[PDB]
Design a protein around this ligand. Sequence first.
Ligand SMILES: Cc1cc2nc3c(=O)[nH]c(=O)nc-3n(C[C@H](O)[C@H](O)[C@H](O)COP(=O)(O)OP(=O)(O)OC[C@H]3O[C@@H](n4cnc5c(N)ncnc54)[C@H](O)[C@@H]3O)c2cc1C
Ligand SMILES: Cc1cc2nc3c(=O)[nH]c(=O)nc-3n(C[C@H](O)[C@H](O)[C@H](O)COP(=O)(O)OP(=O)(O)OC[C@H]3O[C@@H](n4cnc5c(N)ncnc54)[C@H](O)[C@@H]3O)c2cc1C
Ligand SMILES: [Cl-]
Lengths: 435, 441
Amino acid sequence: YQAVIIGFGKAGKTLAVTLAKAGWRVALIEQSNAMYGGTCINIGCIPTKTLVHDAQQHTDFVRAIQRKNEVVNFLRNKNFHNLADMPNIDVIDGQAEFINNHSLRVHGNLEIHGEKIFINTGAQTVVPPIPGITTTPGVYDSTGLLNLKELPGHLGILGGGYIGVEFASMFANFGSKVTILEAASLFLPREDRDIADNIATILRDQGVDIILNAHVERISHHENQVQVHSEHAQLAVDALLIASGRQPATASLHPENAGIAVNERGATVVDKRLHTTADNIWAMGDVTGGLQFTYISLDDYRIVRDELLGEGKRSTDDRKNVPYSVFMTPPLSRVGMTEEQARESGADIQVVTLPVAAIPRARVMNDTRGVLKAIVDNKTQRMLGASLLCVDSHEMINIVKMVMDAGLPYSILRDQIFTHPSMSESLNDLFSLVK
Amino acid sequence: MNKYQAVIIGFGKAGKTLAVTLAKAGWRVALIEQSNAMYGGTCINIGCIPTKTLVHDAQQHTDFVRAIQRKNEVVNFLRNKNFHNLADMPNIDVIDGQAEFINNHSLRVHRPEGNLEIHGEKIFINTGAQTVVPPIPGITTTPGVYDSTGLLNLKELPGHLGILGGGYIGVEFASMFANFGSKVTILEAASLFLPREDRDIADNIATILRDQGVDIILNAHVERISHHENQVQVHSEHAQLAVDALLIASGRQPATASLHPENAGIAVNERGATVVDKRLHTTADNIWAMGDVTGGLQFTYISLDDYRIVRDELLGEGKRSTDDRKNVPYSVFMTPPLSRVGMTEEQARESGADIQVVTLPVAAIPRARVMNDTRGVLKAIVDNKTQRMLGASLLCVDSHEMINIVKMVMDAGLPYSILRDQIFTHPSMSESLNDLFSLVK
Ligand SMILES: Cc1cc2nc3c(=O)[nH]c(=O)nc-3n(C[C@H](O)[C@H](O)[C@H](O)COP(=O)(O)OP(=O)(O)OC[C@H]3O[C@@H](n4cnc5c(N)ncnc54)[C@H](O)[C@@H]3O)c2cc1C
Ligand SMILES: Cc1cc2nc3c(=O)[nH]c(=O)nc-3n(C[C@H](O)[C@H](O)[C@H](O)COP(=O)(O)OP(=O)(O)OC[C@H]3O[C@@H](n4cnc5c(N)ncnc54)[C@H](O)[C@@H]3O)c2cc1C
Ligand SMILES: [Cl-]
């Protein structure tokens, strides 16, 4: 095996198939012999957004859980066939250890060797040191909450991140009271001045309870309900989700035996081109420690592929204007800088917003909530950011990002002919407010 | 009354946008609309808004009457909204009544409570199109015959719907009432279904319609429309057909016969369309024409581009024209929608260029499995000599949003690899364009 990929991650999934067609003889290793395709397929966005779509429709929660199951099972088998149908790939099953820079121990047991090694072990949930989180019924993480038999009446969230907002909106539409608990003073502290307030009013109208400055010190199960204690105060919920955040999973590999350095939270430090301390080993995706997304992982594969099979090289520092989306209802999609970030630099700017009641396509789809906010730099007529909170905003931001990356001025989306009726054509109105 | 610096005939898209634009500059604007139920124009009351609203409810399998009631309140909101966008500015006179030309300058507005006469330094024609009624005996007398207008006000869903003709507007109602739970029968008078799209595309979309119980009878021109036994009866050269409701979907041609443009010097053609410039002038001076009356594309976005052309001339930034148009996109809002831009594979194969045709089935789009609609296709055409793309055929859910990403790369002339290497948003419909252009070999 010249190429050995540890993990069925997005970058590794794509790297293995690409190398086999280039004449390489690849072996990918994976621990979860029942959940292929990586976290994106089984645990991540695919199962989350499959239920999110069901929630907006107000469908039975249990039947929607089964519909996720057939969807996850359909894509899991396909992801395994993409790697097994290829001849030069063997999908060995089992967890992996590092014996040496070129040798791997994998679980009865196997000794697989390789000239090149590529790690895609990803990240995993990091639950805080709270007394009671160890042994308490009703406490679930992102994985365990997706397999819930019944729909709770009151679901509490431990975290105010973007993952906690997705589940808060998801269960609110299902019919459950949701309580979000983040220890911060500001809801969504990395968001704009008024965007977070708009998201707040959208959540609170659906019964969501945003508790700020919260501190949790004990978790028990008093009389059929989970208890969240906050110094002479208790919250009774039927199920508790932890939205703590994920950190790279590079502990069961023993990276010391291969001379691979990791940082303070376990992320294998990498070169601008994803080279690690070991000269012939790469690391793509969440183990890098960069943005924790499926497209950042795929773009890591494009970086390692341009090295192995391509002329010259592209690095990670050409990654400009990386977009992200919070798949609540309606979804928030962001790219570029915020209003706080735009003014933080000594370049004057223009910021006007467009209400969603002014988009006729929003009335067609029966959801007229949110705001369309974009930032234009009057010194070069270029766009420095946009925050679109409306229907299909995840589709919309791709137009906004592609124009920024090309360096084009705002006047293109102001005069471009979009289809009708659509949400992307709102940019005709959104950028006509620029003077 | 006094002379107006600009008068607009019709509450259409270009006319309504121009009225608020000229009044903002201080012009004396007058917009004449012949019906109170047409404030905001065709798109608000009869076109996109009330049709797209029922398609959204149809895809969710909502009750029919519950959707019709929701449709009415959407148009009644936006209609009242569009009346007040214009009737609230002191420089806009929202005059009701049918407008008839008397001169290059004067204009008769037919008010049933006494006629009025309005003069204008500049006149802007914008009266849109009216539905074409094919010359077939029995259409205007049989009670179960509906235009696109009268079908959107139905009381409850019919058990069998008959679409007279194909076309985009025809197929639009075919997927809506079928999804509402009703057998639909599209009777196109042609040898091929959707004759101006590719066959592979047209076959896929006929399979999506047939699986919902919609039979496409071709090579059929009707002779007599009767009402034998409680159903509209349609007579052809082969087996006759019966429907609980017949929908005519033959097209719309410009409304100009009531304007009488002969008295002002404005020229018309045989179908009745105002002859226009590249800057939308007519044969008469200080008189323009905007929208479907010009005989051009009958899209709301083209009508608004018409506004950009006349706004550039009037309010002054040099001048632009209809020659600026290229790669105009369009969508056919069925379920899933068919969005198109650029050339078809036929014209590609006919051009003789060095060409690559790439195809990605929607069943390979993970976002389609998330939205529970894996039907349709994704097709594109690139040129091997220039790395540009000639056209695109996206048949999938939310294709009306991705067709704009494609059109933006084509008008900038950037190579196909722009969409191949691009950090999209996950999970989305647009990210599967990464995998569509990775197929080029
Ligand atoms: C609830 C949730 C929602 C999310 N929503 C989104 C979203 O909307 N958008 C977005 O862009 N991202 C989202 N993500 C993140 C996304 O799932 C990942 O960031 C993305 O899949 C990156 O994966 P990766 O390339 O790092 O490899 P991963 O797919 O993370 O790799 C994990 C795989 O490697 C295997 N593995 C792990 N350790 C070992 C080992 N030692 N030996 C062998 N195999 C091993 C695991 O069994 C698993 O199959 C979400 C994540 C979660 C948990
Ligand atoms: C069923 C259907 C679906 C459609 N779907 C789409 C779609 O998905 N996308 C898209 O882009 N377009 C679509 N269209 C087309 C779009 O709705 C219109 O064609 C577009 O608004 C162009 O209108 P206009 O600007 O020319 O003026 P219009 O709004 O068409 O007409 C202007 C107004 O002038 C008035 N008028 C007429 N005669 C006179 C007179 N003598 N005096 C005074 N006033 C008069 C009429 O009341 C009319 O409302 C659709 C049309 C229909 C019928
Ligand atoms: Cl064209």
